[PDB]
Amino acid sequence: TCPFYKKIPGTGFTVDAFQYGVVEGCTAYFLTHFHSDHYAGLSKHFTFPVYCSEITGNLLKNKLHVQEQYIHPLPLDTECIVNGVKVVLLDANHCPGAVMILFYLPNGTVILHTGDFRADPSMERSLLADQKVHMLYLDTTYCSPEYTFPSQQEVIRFAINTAFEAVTLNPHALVVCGTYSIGKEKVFLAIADVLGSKVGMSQEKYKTLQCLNIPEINSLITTDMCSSLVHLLPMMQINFKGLQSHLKKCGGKYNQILAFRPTGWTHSNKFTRIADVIPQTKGNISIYGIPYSEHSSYLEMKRFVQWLKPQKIIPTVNVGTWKSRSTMEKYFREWKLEAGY
């Protein structure tokens, strides 16, 4: 059954609630982004309206084969009326096409649902600045102080310099980047840009990337592996066995692999700076785990909430254990007392 933290009180609306069959009383289903934990249940046989971003709507049509008549894309940063209710879609700073949703309830309550997001001070000058928010449905993925990680710009610097150095040393080295969903495309696009190459990939993944409205994308990606020295593979092939195998497939064009796994957080972050990251190495293969996050750090999170000053917070992640729920509630109380709302 649909859990409470996916329902919007006083509306006919749910968020990210496609795996529970027909939800009783739901007149419109919102989808925040195209990640399988959130779209779980959609398919070509879905017949209610779906509200979402343009990019999300491209993916639902082309990857899931949802019929066009049920896809309702909305522009970002624009006041729209859905089923008698005013709504705005905001950029989540998550993966391509990801949005937060502002809902203006007919009784005058205002609700923000962040979807998945990486809080940023730029959000403090969106349409959020212009009114009070009563309730916040918050992405609490990393809502603990041990979750620190660097900015995305720092991590991209590290990857660029790393890849440029190795390939300049050895023009016969191949770079591989692991992927399993949309998101984090900056990692492989940055690296291919510094090396003067296109990114090569499967037909399925090229198709997914053709849905995203990225500028000049025909110029950066390809399905011809032979012409590219940056390859993408499934995240599950990013290991010594998978990478030896792939290397054999390139027909002696290459004699070394430098591979990247963009992870969220890894406990190495409590001790080690980005400058100090080192690979796992076996033979002619090295593997780097890089902490490229598309979710808020604890501090980034805390700053957004203290700025927004909500009356009530409803977590949408780590809600399944009493120890989690307790821990989060304690931080929310700390933030409130420190700021004074």
Angle at the Cα of 16 from the Cα atoms of 50 and 92, rounded to 5 degrees = 95
* Nearest CB to Ni ion, comparing residues 31 and 123: 31
- CA within 13 Å, CB half, 323: 0
CA distances from 56 to 72, 95, 240, 330 (A): 10, 10, 35, 35
Q: Does 35 bind Ni ion (CB under 5 A)?
A: yes
- Is the CB of 11 or the CB of 114 nearer to Ni ion? 114
Site mask for Ni ion (CB under 5 A), range 184-223, x = bound: ----------------------------------------
Interface of this chain with Ni ion, residues 98 to 117, rule: CB under 5 A: 116
For the bound state, the minimum distance from the C-beta of residue 176 to Ni ion, rounded and expressed in Å, comes to 23
Residues in contact with Ni ion, shown as a per-residue x/- string from 62 to 101 under the rule CB under 5 A: ----------------------------------------
Least distance from C-beta 133 to Ni ion, angstroms? 22
To Ni ion, the closest distance from the beta carbon of 75 in angstroms equals 22
Spell out, one character per residue from 116 to 155, where the chain touches Ni ion: x when CB under 5 A holds, - when not.
Answer: x---------------------------------------
Strands lying side by side in the sheet with 80-82:
80-82, 85-91, 99-104, 110-113, 135-138, 312-315
Number of residues in contact with Ni ion under rule CB under 5 A: 2
Q: After which residues is the chain broken (C to N over 2.5 A)?
A: none
- Which one, 141 or 197, has the nearer CB to Ni ion? 141
Residue 121 is given by DSSP the state G
Provide the minimum distance between the beta carbon of 223 and Ni ion in the complex, in angstroms, as a whole number. Answer: 26
CB 175 within 8 A of CB 159: no
Name the minimum Å distance from CB 94 to Ni ion: 6
Q: Which is nearer to Ni ion, 35 or 205 (CB)?
A: 35
Helices (H), 72-202: 152-169, 185-195
CB of 148 to Ni ion, least distance (A): 20
Q: Quick one: residue 188, left, alpha or beta (phi over 0 = left, psi -120 to 50 = alpha)? A: alpha
Burial of residue 56 (number of CB atoms within 10 Å: 0-12, 13-18, 19+): buried
Question: Phi and psi for 249 in degrees, rounded to 5?
Answer: -60, -25
Q: Tell me which residues touch Ni ion (CB under 5 A).
A: 35, 116
